[PDB]
Amino acid sequence: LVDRDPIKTSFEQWAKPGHFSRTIAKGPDTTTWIWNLHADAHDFDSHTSDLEEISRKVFSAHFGQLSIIFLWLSGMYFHGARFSNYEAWLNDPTHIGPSAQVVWPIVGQEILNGDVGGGFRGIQITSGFFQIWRASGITSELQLYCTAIGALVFAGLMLFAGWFHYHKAAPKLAWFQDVESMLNHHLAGLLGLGSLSWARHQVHVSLPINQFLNAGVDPKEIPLPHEFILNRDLLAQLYPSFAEGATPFFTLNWSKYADFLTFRGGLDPLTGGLWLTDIAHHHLAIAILFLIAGHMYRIKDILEAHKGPFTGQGHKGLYEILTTSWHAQLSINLAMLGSLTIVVAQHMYSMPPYPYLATDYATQLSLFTHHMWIGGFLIVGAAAHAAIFMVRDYDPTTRYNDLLDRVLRHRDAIISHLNWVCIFLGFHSFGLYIHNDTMSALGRPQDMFSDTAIQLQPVFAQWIQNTHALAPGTTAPGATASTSLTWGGGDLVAVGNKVALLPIPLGTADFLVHHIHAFTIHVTVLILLKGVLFARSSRLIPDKANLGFRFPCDGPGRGGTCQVSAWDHVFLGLFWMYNSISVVIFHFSWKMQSDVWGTINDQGVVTHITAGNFAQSSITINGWLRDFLWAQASQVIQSYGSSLSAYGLFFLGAHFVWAFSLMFLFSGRGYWQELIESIVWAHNKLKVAPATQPRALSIVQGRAVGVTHYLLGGIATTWAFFLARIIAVG
Amino acid sequence: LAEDPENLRWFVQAELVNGRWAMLGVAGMLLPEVFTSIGIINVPKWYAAGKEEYFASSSTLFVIEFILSHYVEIRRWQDIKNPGSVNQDPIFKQYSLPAGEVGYPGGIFNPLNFAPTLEAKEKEIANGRLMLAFLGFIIQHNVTGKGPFDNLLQHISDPWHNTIVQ
Amino acid sequence: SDPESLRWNVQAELVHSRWAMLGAAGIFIPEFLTKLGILNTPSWYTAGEQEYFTDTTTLFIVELVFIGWAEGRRWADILNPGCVNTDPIFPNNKLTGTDVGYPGGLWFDPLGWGSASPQKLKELRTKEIKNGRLAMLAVMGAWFQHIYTGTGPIDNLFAAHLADPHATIFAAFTPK
Amino acid sequence: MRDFKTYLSVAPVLSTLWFGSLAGLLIEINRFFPDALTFPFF
Amino acid sequence: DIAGLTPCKESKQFAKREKQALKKLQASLKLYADDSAPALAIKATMEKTKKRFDNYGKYGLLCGSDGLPHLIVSGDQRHWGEFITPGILFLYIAGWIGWVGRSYLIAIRDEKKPTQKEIIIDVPLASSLLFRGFSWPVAAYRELLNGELVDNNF
Ligand code: CLA
Ligand code: CLA
Ligand code: CLA
Ligand code: CLA
Ligand SMILES: CC1=C(C/C=C(\C)CCC[C@H](C)CCC[C@@H](C)CCCC(C)C)C(=O)c2ccccc2C1=O
């Protein structure tokens, strides 16, 4: 390509058919290249055979995410502001049931807008702003309206840094191809200087402006816009102005104190969102580390070190090419970023970190399943992109004889095991349930697997739960309750509208879901593991790195020779994970409502959204639609003519879109060709078709329009199924 | 390779029959406007003859006539595929034989001809439309009204009326 | 490093300009002309104070039967004859192009020296104040804003309100 | 600046300024007549 | 008139629908807007579905049991424009979608390399072949079946 250059046009390329592999989009017309162009639009086997740029693009086309997450948030802060309900909800929590969005009464619309709290028509929320927002050491609607434009500021600017890259004549190699410092910085002072900084604006301002909110008032009968400077006088109620101490150290006297923190654990009676008196200390006690920690270092050295006998000789030298990969140092990350998201999903529901959550049921489970699909949707990826490594990234083979060349050495092996693992599971991990049916429908309970028939006896208790809620008696200092109230030992009194967390008991019907997870988590990974491992060569095809990591299927021979590849192992690996997460969700809420969520009154006689129906009745896998799907969902199929209605009214579409995927999943290809011409014929008679040769779907595009649909179908189905059984009773 | 038009016979003859019947159509109105008082739909019947019998019906009248119009009309058909109408003043016009510098094909714009004494189907061009579009006009404004023009007392000035229907 | 955008009709934008803006003359001088206290008063009784209204939307019809007529005739034979088909001379046509209009037809032309040249000298006059008029009216059309926004008491709409000193509108000057 | 026998181009999805809008002006007829199911005529 | 019941002039079941259902729209003794200027069930949403009283127009409109109105359209008693009036309308609008389909298409395959001019668009919508549709009096109803798209080209 010209047009023409090198050097010697500014005149930009708008006009002249094509670009992207060289007997390119050819003069001669076609359609396939219009899904080409969008797909693989980002890729790197083309653009140039030379690293250089690519990192100079990804550090820019990156940017436009932050900026975006930044245009987003703004319409959420704005939204969570003038489309109010926040002002109204906060003087009045336990009571309200929040909104931010509202229609405009065009056509049918309005049904969707149904009285939500501080006196107005709207559609609800299961996205816990209104609750980060508890923070506001200040309060005010127009104020969020500054935090809002403060958002659009970071954006335009944190979006003109993206002009101020690639398009501007760019940095180069050394800049990233000296890695030497990167984490040094990152973790030290941002990971640090945020958490740190967050400390300073987490007791300064917030703690006090909810220390005396957890009582009454109406805001501006509290927390001015400046009030919190030098005036270290209201900081007087929430500890000393250090009195006689000077910059910690010890020649200090406490005859009666010990700074803010004074460590909690449990839950505010009046706002059980976990205590804040702590929340500063923990973030402070973070940062320090990061503050000390981001001070390594300059790199091989540490990895060029510990080897052994069978261990990893190539451990030593574990990648020069880890300054020369991406597709590698992205895949690693996704496993972590991803696997480090759904660890949120627990510490959240068994330890709320915001005021008013749990009581708020629906506004932190939405969460625990949204955060849950990322700690999964980012993991199969975290494999895909390793397959993208394993196939291609490096120039030649300069990488040699090491940890990997090792793992591969065995490979019909690491995956030889893992397999049997799964059929051991599955048999012990699902037909287990099927016993029950076949023998409870035969009907002889003597011999089921009930929490009571097969020998276990009115106790689960003695394991580690019961040595967690009881541990404030070790090296442990203490502080009433535990760490997470859901643990075996002691305490009850949690909240005065509805409930929050309490013990959460186990045994079987907790024993075996917990095991289906195993088998589910395991056969997921089998297919990804073997998939990324056998990326490039095999004894079904060895001539098998020769195009890319996709390729439809090699060809009718060898018997099958179809699925193979690794786009496709990252195609049938999604297919499982949709279950992996989709059944983990199914788990939590049936627990968390069967027990936990429920409610106090006199003598606090607890009354769960369901008197533990779980008991003897999830163990039957029909009980999973006797007690679940057919029981709850009665709220989705009753939901017409209401306010939420948009869920029942989705629940048919998307419970349709899924049942459209199979068409894309289950079908041939020269088929819709053979068909597309009958069409093309009738077209030509009137004189109406040929130009831009209309073509069927690109074997693997077809699979691309399976899967993606099967998910946005099979998923939102419950996104509806859910929001419709926590809004309204529960 | 048949570049463009064409047509011809075609719907130039298409028109003049619109033209000259929109012209007549409005002779319809003509009446009730000078010594005025009598019309609209007036769903005539239509001028009505003697005091010796009809009597609301005596018959579908209306319905018949145009059975007649009917084979007279096959007749003009019975002309335009293959030119046959003595005068010959529509199909191209009279001035016997001629105009058909468009009868055998090859037009593009072709203006035409046809009066011996003298001039043409031309300023019978534009009475041609004045009346087609007039009807357009005429049974445009019913659907709310039915009368024209007095003096400068209080009529021609449009005072207050009532939407379209709605 | 600099845009890709001299709209070739970079040549035509400039002639709704002399349209828009010469035009704002009609508002600029007749306004403040007005005639402060003429002697004085604005009163229009005549066709207007008894014959049941005068205009509004018989207003427009008559009003821009003419603007109708004239604005059309304006750009659509500014010039351009040749007036059809079929290969490129660019503006998005000049498919008039190399032929102005007629090969020895009539007096398509104005003026001797085989063109249209309204002679050579007169860059003077209307380069200056006139694409001025473009500029000028930018800022006393930026006064349209100042001149009235604030909907003189008689209405606060969507009540922020949002502070309060004193009023605003027009007549000339300013407190300061 | 655009005379006779086709004109200047336009992008991939100006359909997104054709679905959104035009069609958009139609809600604009579906509130002027906030309702249908048959219709009076003009 | 036909299989269901009679229109609006009487339709008992239909009446009950007007009333319970909507008016429980009510259902909120108050819910505070004594004077307040937002929460608009209050004004219309009802009244816009409601002032739709013993009038909806009058439409005929048959209304079965439960009094939801059924559409016959067999061209009789009253019901003609529940298909034809909005039927020819569907026809006319489409067909002037594709009359121009068969147009900002049959205007290209020529000149010099014309192999995807169509992923960009030469005249947007066609904005040239545009009105050819309203500028269809008769049109394809003759010229389609005679010449051009002529059996030849068939
Ligand atoms: C106003 C400015 C502008 C202009 C005229 C250009 C022009 C160009 N850029 Mg570019 N760029 C810009 C701003 C601009 N850029 C900014 C602000 C950034 C950083 C944010 C970049 C980052 C960038 C990179 C990495 C590259 C270019 C490249 C190019 C060249 C190819 C452009 C192209 O066809 O991409 C078409 C794409 C767009 C027009 C849209 C850009 C996508 C982002 C910024 C917004 C869209 C996201 C949006 C939310 C859509 C998803 C949601 C959807 C449902 C609506 C071209 C010369 C490329 C090059 O050098 O040649 C190989 C190179 O790849 N640019
Ligand atoms: C940190 C990571 C992130 C980044 C930066 C990338 C970057 C990349 N990935 Mg990737 N990937 C990721 C996470 C990431 N991935 C994850 C988590 C997965 C697992 C699902 C994958 C699975 C994956 C595969 C299989 C492939 C890539 C490929 C690529 C490359 C192609 C990108 C492209 O052209 O856009 C592609 C995006 C589109 C074409 C847009 C279509 C999006 C559709 C499906 C919409 C999604 C549904 C949604 C609900 C619809 C919107 C709403 C609608 C209803 C209105 C690029 C280098 C491709 C490659 O060939 O490598 C060179 C290869 O195809 N990725
Ligand atoms: C085209 C085909 C035909 C049709 C009409 C259907 C229709 C359906 N099938 Mg189905 N099916 C078929 C052939 C068909 N199938 C075949 C051949 C098979 C294989 C044998 C199947 C196998 C199958 C299965 C297994 C299932 C279905 C199901 C369904 C139903 C989903 C419920 C629903 O849509 O409620 C109708 C109500 C709506 C769609 C309301 C929609 C309102 C929303 C979406 C908003 C408006 C639209 C808007 C554009 C969306 C927003 C998007 C925006 C971003 C642009 C639906 C009735 C599923 C079911 O529900 O029970 C069996 C089930 O999963 N089918
Ligand atoms: C301009 C348009 C055009 C025209 C005149 C036709 C005409 C036809 N199509 Mg068709 N089609 C089109 C575009 C068009 N199509 C497109 C874009 C697709 C998507 C691939 C199809 C997919 C399709 C299928 C599967 C079938 C037909 C069939 C048919 C025939 C039956 C009519 C019918 O019931 O389908 C209704 C028409 C559609 C479903 C097409 C939707 C696309 C329309 C809305 C195009 C609108 C114009 C478009 C925006 C062009 C841009 C305008 C440009 C001038 C600027 C008929 C000859 C059927 C057949 O072969 O039997 C004879 C067959 O079932 N079509
Ligand atoms: C149904 C099916 C098809 C047929 C599906 C097709 C042809 C979908 C493509 C349809 C396109 C998206 C229609 C695009 C037309 C419009 C975008 C053009 C008009 C523009 C708008 C204004 C309407 C395959 O090609 C296929 C291939 C491989 C495995 C399975 C399958 C499969 O299951």
JSON list of N, CA and C in Angstrom, two decimals, chain E residues 82-113:
[
{"chain": "E", "resi": 82, "resn": "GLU", "atom": "N", "xyz": [-59.62, -1.63, 8.80]},
{"chain": "E", "resi": 82, "resn": "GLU", "atom": "CA", "xyz": [-58.84, -2.28, 9.86]},
{"chain": "E", "resi": 82, "resn": "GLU", "atom": "C", "xyz": [-57.85, -3.22, 9.20]},
{"chain": "E", "resi": 83, "resn": "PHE", "atom": "N", "xyz": [-57.73, -3.07, 7.88]},
{"chain": "E", "resi": 83, "resn": "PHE", "atom": "CA", "xyz": [-56.84, -3.88, 7.07]},
{"chain": "E", "resi": 83, "resn": "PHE", "atom": "C", "xyz": [-56.52, -3.26, 5.72]},
{"chain": "E", "resi": 84, "resn": "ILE", "atom": "N", "xyz": [-57.56, -2.80, 5.02]},
{"chain": "E", "resi": 84, "resn": "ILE", "atom": "CA", "xyz": [-57.39, -2.24, 3.70]},
{"chain": "E", "resi": 84, "resn": "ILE", "atom": "C", "xyz": [-56.82, -0.83, 3.86]},
{"chain": "E", "resi": 85, "resn": "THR", "atom": "N", "xyz": [-57.58, 0.06, 4.51]},
{"chain": "E", "resi": 85, "resn": "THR", "atom": "CA", "xyz": [-57.08, 1.42, 4.82]},
{"chain": "E", "resi": 85, "resn": "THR", "atom": "C", "xyz": [-55.64, 1.39, 5.38]},
{"chain": "E", "resi": 86, "resn": "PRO", "atom": "N", "xyz": [-55.36, 0.53, 6.39]},
{"chain": "E", "resi": 86, "resn": "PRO", "atom": "CA", "xyz": [-53.98, 0.39, 6.80]},
{"chain": "E", "resi": 86, "resn": "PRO", "atom": "C", "xyz": [-53.28, -0.77, 6.09]},
{"chain": "E", "resi": 87, "resn": "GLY", "atom": "N", "xyz": [-53.88, -1.27, 5.00]},
{"chain": "E", "resi": 87, "resn": "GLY", "atom": "CA", "xyz": [-53.33, -2.38, 4.22]},
{"chain": "E", "resi": 87, "resn": "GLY", "atom": "C", "xyz": [-52.66, -1.90, 2.96]},
{"chain": "E", "resi": 88, "resn": "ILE", "atom": "N", "xyz": [-53.40, -1.17, 2.12]},
{"chain": "E", "resi": 88, "resn": "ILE", "atom": "CA", "xyz": [-52.81, -0.55, 0.94]},
{"chain": "E", "resi": 88, "resn": "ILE", "atom": "C", "xyz": [-51.67, 0.35, 1.43]},
{"chain": "E", "resi": 89, "resn": "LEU", "atom": "N", "xyz": [-51.90, 0.99, 2.58]},
{"chain": "E", "resi": 89, "resn": "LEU", "atom": "CA", "xyz": [-50.87, 1.79, 3.22]},
{"chain": "E", "resi": 89, "resn": "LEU", "atom": "C", "xyz": [-49.59, 0.98, 3.40]},
{"chain": "E", "resi": 90, "resn": "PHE", "atom": "N", "xyz": [-49.67, -0.22, 3.97]},
{"chain": "E", "resi": 90, "resn": "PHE", "atom": "CA", "xyz": [-48.47, -1.07, 4.09]},
{"chain": "E", "resi": 90, "resn": "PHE", "atom": "C", "xyz": [-47.87, -1.38, 2.74]},
{"chain": "E", "resi": 91, "resn": "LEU", "atom": "N", "xyz": [-48.73, -1.70, 1.77]},
{"chain": "E", "resi": 91, "resn": "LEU", "atom": "CA", "xyz": [-48.25, -1.99, 0.44]},
{"chain": "E", "resi": 91, "resn": "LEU", "atom": "C", "xyz": [-47.52, -0.78, -0.11]},
{"chain": "E", "resi": 92, "resn": "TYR", "atom": "N", "xyz": [-48.21, 0.35, -0.26]},
{"chain": "E", "resi": 92, "resn": "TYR", "atom": "CA", "xyz": [-47.64, 1.57, -0.86]},
{"chain": "E", "resi": 92, "resn": "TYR", "atom": "C", "xyz": [-46.27, 1.96, -0.28]},
{"chain": "E", "resi": 93, "resn": "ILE", "atom": "N", "xyz": [-46.16, 1.95, 1.05]},
{"chain": "E", "resi": 93, "resn": "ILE", "atom": "CA", "xyz": [-44.92, 2.32, 1.75]},
{"chain": "E", "resi": 93, "resn": "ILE", "atom": "C", "xyz": [-43.77, 1.36, 1.42]},
{"chain": "E", "resi": 94, "resn": "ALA", "atom": "N", "xyz": [-43.93, 0.08, 1.75]},
{"chain": "E", "resi": 94, "resn": "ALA", "atom": "CA", "xyz": [-43.07, -0.94, 1.16]},
{"chain": "E", "resi": 94, "resn": "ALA", "atom": "C", "xyz": [-43.29, -0.87, -0.35]},
{"chain": "E", "resi": 95, "resn": "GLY", "atom": "N", "xyz": [-42.44, -1.50, -1.15]},
{"chain": "E", "resi": 95, "resn": "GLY", "atom": "CA", "xyz": [-42.60, -1.36, -2.59]},
{"chain": "E", "resi": 95, "resn": "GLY", "atom": "C", "xyz": [-42.11, 0.00, -3.06]},
{"chain": "E", "resi": 96, "resn": "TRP", "atom": "N", "xyz": [-42.29, 1.04, -2.24]},
{"chain": "E", "resi": 96, "resn": "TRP", "atom": "CA", "xyz": [-41.51, 2.26, -2.43]},
{"chain": "E", "resi": 96, "resn": "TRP", "atom": "C", "xyz": [-40.32, 2.26, -1.47]},
{"chain": "E", "resi": 97, "resn": "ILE", "atom": "N", "xyz": [-40.13, 1.12, -0.80]},
{"chain": "E", "resi": 97, "resn": "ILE", "atom": "CA", "xyz": [-38.89, 0.81, -0.10]},
{"chain": "E", "resi": 97, "resn": "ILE", "atom": "C", "xyz": [-38.00, 0.06, -1.08]},
{"chain": "E", "resi": 98, "resn": "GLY", "atom": "N", "xyz": [-38.61, -0.86, -1.82]},
{"chain": "E", "resi": 98, "resn": "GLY", "atom": "CA", "xyz": [-37.90, -1.76, -2.73]},
{"chain": "E", "resi": 98, "resn": "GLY", "atom": "C", "xyz": [-37.98, -1.39, -4.20]},
{"chain": "E", "resi": 99, "resn": "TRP", "atom": "N", "xyz": [-38.92, -0.51, -4.55]},
{"chain": "E", "resi": 99, "resn": "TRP", "atom": "CA", "xyz": [-38.91, 0.09, -5.87]},
{"chain": "E", "resi": 99, "resn": "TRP", "atom": "C", "xyz": [-37.60, 0.82, -5.98]},
{"chain": "E", "resi": 100, "resn": "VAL", "atom": "N", "xyz": [-37.18, 1.39, -4.85]},
{"chain": "E", "resi": 100, "resn": "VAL", "atom": "CA", "xyz": [-35.89, 2.04, -4.76]},
{"chain": "E", "resi": 100, "resn": "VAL", "atom": "C", "xyz": [-34.78, 1.05, -4.36]},
{"chain": "E", "resi": 101, "resn": "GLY", "atom": "N", "xyz": [-35.16, -0.08, -3.76]},
{"chain": "E", "resi": 101, "resn": "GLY", "atom": "CA", "xyz": [-34.27, -1.23, -3.67]},
{"chain": "E", "resi": 101, "resn": "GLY", "atom": "C", "xyz": [-33.79, -1.64, -5.05]},
{"chain": "E", "resi": 102, "resn": "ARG", "atom": "N", "xyz": [-34.74, -1.96, -5.94]},
{"chain": "E", "resi": 102, "resn": "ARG", "atom": "CA", "xyz": [-34.47, -2.16, -7.36]},
{"chain": "E", "resi": 102, "resn": "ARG", "atom": "C", "xyz": [-34.14, -0.82, -8.05]},
{"chain": "E", "resi": 103, "resn": "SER", "atom": "N", "xyz": [-33.41, 0.08, -7.38]},
{"chain": "E", "resi": 103, "resn": "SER", "atom": "CA", "xyz": [-33.04, 1.37, -8.00]},
{"chain": "E", "resi": 103, "resn": "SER", "atom": "C", "xyz": [-31.67, 1.94, -7.59]},
{"chain": "E", "resi": 104, "resn": "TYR", "atom": "N", "xyz": [-31.45, 2.31, -6.32]},
{"chain": "E", "resi": 104, "resn": "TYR", "atom": "CA", "xyz": [-30.06, 2.49, -5.88]},
{"chain": "E", "resi": 104, "resn": "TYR", "atom": "C", "xyz": [-29.49, 1.08, -5.83]},
{"chain": "E", "resi": 105, "resn": "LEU", "atom": "N", "xyz": [-29.64, 0.43, -6.98]},
{"chain": "E", "resi": 105, "resn": "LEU", "atom": "CA", "xyz": [-29.01, -0.83, -7.31]},
{"chain": "E", "resi": 105, "resn": "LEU", "atom": "C", "xyz": [-28.93, -0.94, -8.82]},
{"chain": "E", "resi": 106, "resn": "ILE", "atom": "N", "xyz": [-30.04, -0.77, -9.53]},
{"chain": "E", "resi": 106, "resn": "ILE", "atom": "CA", "xyz": [-29.94, -0.92, -10.98]},
{"chain": "E", "resi": 106, "resn": "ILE", "atom": "C", "xyz": [-29.25, 0.28, -11.63]},
{"chain": "E", "resi": 107, "resn": "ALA", "atom": "N", "xyz": [-28.81, 1.23, -10.80]},
{"chain": "E", "resi": 107, "resn": "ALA", "atom": "CA", "xyz": [-28.04, 2.37, -11.30]},
{"chain": "E", "resi": 107, "resn": "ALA", "atom": "C", "xyz": [-26.52, 2.14, -11.21]},
{"chain": "E", "resi": 108, "resn": "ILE", "atom": "N", "xyz": [-26.12, 0.93, -10.83]},
{"chain": "E", "resi": 108, "resn": "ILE", "atom": "CA", "xyz": [-24.70, 0.60, -10.69]},
{"chain": "E", "resi": 108, "resn": "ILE", "atom": "C", "xyz": [-24.38, -0.85, -11.09]},
{"chain": "E", "resi": 109, "resn": "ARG", "atom": "N", "xyz": [-23.29, -0.98, -11.86]},
{"chain": "E", "resi": 109, "resn": "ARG", "atom": "CA", "xyz": [-22.71, -2.23, -12.41]},
{"chain": "E", "resi": 109, "resn": "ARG", "atom": "C", "xyz": [-21.88, -1.84, -13.65]},
{"chain": "E", "resi": 110, "resn": "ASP", "atom": "N", "xyz": [-21.51, -0.55, -13.69]},
{"chain": "E", "resi": 110, "resn": "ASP", "atom": "CA", "xyz": [-21.08, 0.12, -14.92]},
{"chain": "E", "resi": 110, "resn": "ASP", "atom": "C", "xyz": [-19.86, 1.05, -14.72]},
{"chain": "E", "resi": 111, "resn": "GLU", "atom": "N", "xyz": [-19.66, 1.95, -15.71]},
{"chain": "E", "resi": 111, "resn": "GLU", "atom": "CA", "xyz": [-18.62, 3.03, -15.73]},
{"chain": "E", "resi": 111, "resn": "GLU", "atom": "C", "xyz": [-17.19, 2.51, -15.56]},
{"chain": "E", "resi": 112, "resn": "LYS", "atom": "N", "xyz": [-16.63, 2.68, -14.36]},
{"chain": "E", "resi": 112, "resn": "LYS", "atom": "CA", "xyz": [-15.36, 2.03, -13.99]},
{"chain": "E", "resi": 112, "resn": "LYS", "atom": "C", "xyz": [-15.54, 1.30, -12.64]},
{"chain": "E", "resi": 113, "resn": "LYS", "atom": "N", "xyz": [-14.48, 0.65, -12.14]},
{"chain": "E", "resi": 113, "resn": "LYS", "atom": "CA", "xyz": [-14.62, -0.46, -11.16]},
{"chain": "E", "resi": 113, "resn": "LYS", "atom": "C", "xyz": [-15.68, -0.28, -10.04]}
]
